[PDB]
Each structure stands twice: as C-alpha cells, then as structure tokens.
Write a protein that binds this ligand. Structure first.
Ligand SMILES: O=C1Cc2cc(Nc3nc(Cl)ncc3F)ccc2N1
Ligand SMILES: O=C1Cc2cc(Nc3nc(Cl)ncc3F)ccc2N1
Ligand SMILES: [Cl-]
Ligand SMILES: [Cl-]
Lengths: 4, 124, 124, 4
C-alpha cells in the first residue's frame, strides 16, 4: 500500500 | 482525496480475468477470425480495443454473442493480441510482427501499433 | 517466453472498466445492500472478492441478475470497497475503518483486511 | 514497454  | 492505493491491484485483477478466460468462466462472446474461434469477455475486449469499444457500445451489436472479423485478419495475429489484452505481454517476433501490427491497427490498439512501428524502424 | 510487456496496461484496463461502470455499460448484476443498489460487472467482482468468485462460479447463482448481501453489511462500507475494486484506491477513514474491515472480511478481500488490521493496530 |  502507498500514498498515491 | 485522502485514499491509500494497493500497487499490485490492477495486475492482480488482470491475472484473475485471464484465469477466468482460461477456465471459460463468464465468457460472453466468440470472436471468429476465418476458421478460428476465440472466446472472451466483452468488457476486457472493450477496455483494450477502440474497435471493440465501438462494437459493444452500439445498441444492436452489444447483444451479439458472435462477432466475425474481416477475412484479411490473421488468426495468429489476433491470438497474440488477445493474449496481450489479458496479460500485458506481447509475443512480438520477426515472423509475426507484420501480422500483429496490421491486426493492432484494425483493432485500434494504439500502444501496440506504436511498439511495432519502432521495432520495424530499428530493422530498416 | 521472449515477450515484451507494457507496464501501464493493467492500470489502463482497470481505468477503462471503471469508465464502463460509470456510464453503466455492460453491467450485468445489481448488488443489494439493504435499501441501496449497486450496479457492477460480475467479472470484476469475481476477480476482486473470494465471496463473489464463489457466487458466480456456482451453476445456479451465476445466472442471477440480483444478489442480496447479509443485512449486517453497511452500504457505505460496500461502496468504498466497490470503488477500490475498480480503482485500486481505498478511502479508509477513522469513521469508516470498522465497517470497511467487516465488509472486506465478508467479501473475502484479504489485502484490504490486512491494511485495516495494520491501521487499527497503529491506533491502539 | 520493458523486458519483463
Ligand atoms: O488504442 C485504444 C485502446 C482503446 C480502448 C478504449 N476503451 C474504452 N475507452 C473509454 Cl474512453 N472508456 C471505456 C473503454 F472501454 C477506447 C479506445 C481505445 N483506443
Ligand atoms: O482475497 C481474495 C481476493 C480473491 C479473488 C479471487 N478471484 C479469482 N481467483 C481465481 Cl484463483 N481465479 C479467478 C478469480 F476471479 C478468489 C479469491 C480471492 N480472495
Ligand atoms: Cl494498446
Ligand atoms: Cl483485497
């Protein structure tokens, strides 16, 4: 999961 | 927005759609390319091809379970492009590049047409 | 194999499937979550959820155009997860995390359940 | 395009  | 994003989600969705295709699950159309038949999902075809997007948004054609392509289309070229739609991988070879490019032009798959043009230019 | 791969293909396919959903093109099921209705593509639901994979591979249920979820399921939680299926982005907030995690457990979306558990653990 |  990432900060888009 | 303040969303988080799962990097591998799109790739995982496509892998599962290819597994459904392999197992013939919920395939809703047969594409006929001369003597050959290819089963697929209308939604995947529309998401990948400008030609299929135009066909399945037409009020009459959206209801067909069989689509016949132009007799000039090579079945091997179509098979390679269908595999690309479901996997992102294109089996481009010296022996098939002309048929693949001609098929991608007909199906309106601009990114494939772009890589074929570049590989042909490099050979000249 | 000796294939080439287009990095952005899977993301571009998913973006187009979300555009078809927005425009209600070739949606083939309605998911009912109490008083709310959500239209979607069976193939996308199956590719993302272990519960929908089990439902639409069943010989009787594969033919239904309406699926009613358990009354304990929160419609907002379902809406957030449906948006995630079609976009890879999860709108996870302090006010919705419990409903989202409960819905993801019911739908069998292991990666979502994993991130919810981690965000809850960090708050404790 | 890349070599996968
Ligand atoms: O080279 C290409 C690939 C391609 C795919 C599509 N697909 C869709 N386009 C839109 Cl805007 N919404 C939903 C779709 F399924 C249209 C045109 C083109 N041309
Ligand atoms: O957390 C999850 C997400 C998820 C999706 C699927 N989907 C499919 N699985 C297979 Cl093997 N082939 C085709 C599919 F559409 C099954 C189980 C699970 N569990
Ligand atoms: Cl393309
Ligand atoms: Cl997940």
């Amino acid at each position: 999961w990432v900060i888009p | 927005d303040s969303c988080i994003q799962f990097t591998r989600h799109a790739s995982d969705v496509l892998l599962n759609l290819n597994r459904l295709r392999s197992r013939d699950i919920l395939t809703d159309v047969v594409i006929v390319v001369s003597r050959e038949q290819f089963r697929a999902h209308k939604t995947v075809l529309m998401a990948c091809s400008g030609l299929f997007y135009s066909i399945f948004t037409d009020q009459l054609k959206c209801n067909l379970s069989v689509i016949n392509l132009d007799p000039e289309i090579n079945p091997e070229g179509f098979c390679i492009l269908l595999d690309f739609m479901y996997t992102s991988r294109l089996n481009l070879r010296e022996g098939n590049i002309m048929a693949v490019m001609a098929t991608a032009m007909y199906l309106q798959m601009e990114h494939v047409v772009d890589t074929c043009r570049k590989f042909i230019k490099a050979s000249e």
